[PDB]
Each structure stands twice: as structure tokens, then as C-alpha cells.
Amino acid sequence: GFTGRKITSQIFIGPTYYQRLKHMVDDKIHSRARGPIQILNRQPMEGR
DNA sequence: CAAACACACCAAACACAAGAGCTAATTGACTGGCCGTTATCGATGTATATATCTGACACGTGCCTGGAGACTAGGGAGTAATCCCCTTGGC
Secondary structure, eight states, X not given: OOSOOOOSSOOOOOOOXXXXXXXXXXXXXXXXXXXXXXXXXXXXXXXX
């Protein structure tokens, strides 16, 4: 794609049926900096 | 015979079962006794609405008193003539 030179090996390309799972990235990314604390033991909370 | 320890067996518990990471949803106490507030039922009225009886005013009927009508009886009031007493009038 970049230079326009043929690829020495012959790639294997064709139609094929692909799915998409629900595991998006934005639903898993998480971070913390001195968030809310628990009431029993004064430690950070659990769960995104 | 009684006491020491050892062994095999039976009976009784302890603690562990990798690192974690994300998401969802089921549970949101309940009869009863009792006090405290408040809603309701009840009496004890006084105020207002209506019914009965009494009093004053009004229209109407009435009993009673006095007044009025037609008719009568018979005599009181009243013309027409007369006398002559007496008054007005006179010198």
C-alpha cells in the first residue's frame, strides 16, 4: 500500500464472515487517583 | 492384682481448595397492646323556622232601639157676618 511494489509472497485474500463481540474497549478502560473510599476499612472502592 | 507404656482402632474436628477483572438482578417485616391525636357519636344548649293560640284591626252580619209610612178618627184651627164697645179725633 505504501510504495506500490508487489509483495513477493502471494497473499491469501477472500470473503469471510466476521463477528463483533460486545467487549468494547471503552467499557473496560479505567483509572483512579484518590477516589472514594469504603466505610468499613478506609481503602479504595472496587469496580469500574 | 494393680499400674506403667505401647499399639491398633474408633471417634471427633480444622483448614484449604489460583490471580483476579467486568456486568446484571432479589431481597425494600410483621400482629398485638398500649398511649397519644384526632374523628366521630352524643347531651345540652341557644338561635332561627314553623305551628298554635291570643290580641287588635277589618269587613260583614245582626239584635235592638228609635224613627218613619199609610191610613184613620174626630176635633183643633179657621172663613164669613155681626154687634157695639171703645178708641181716635175734634173744638
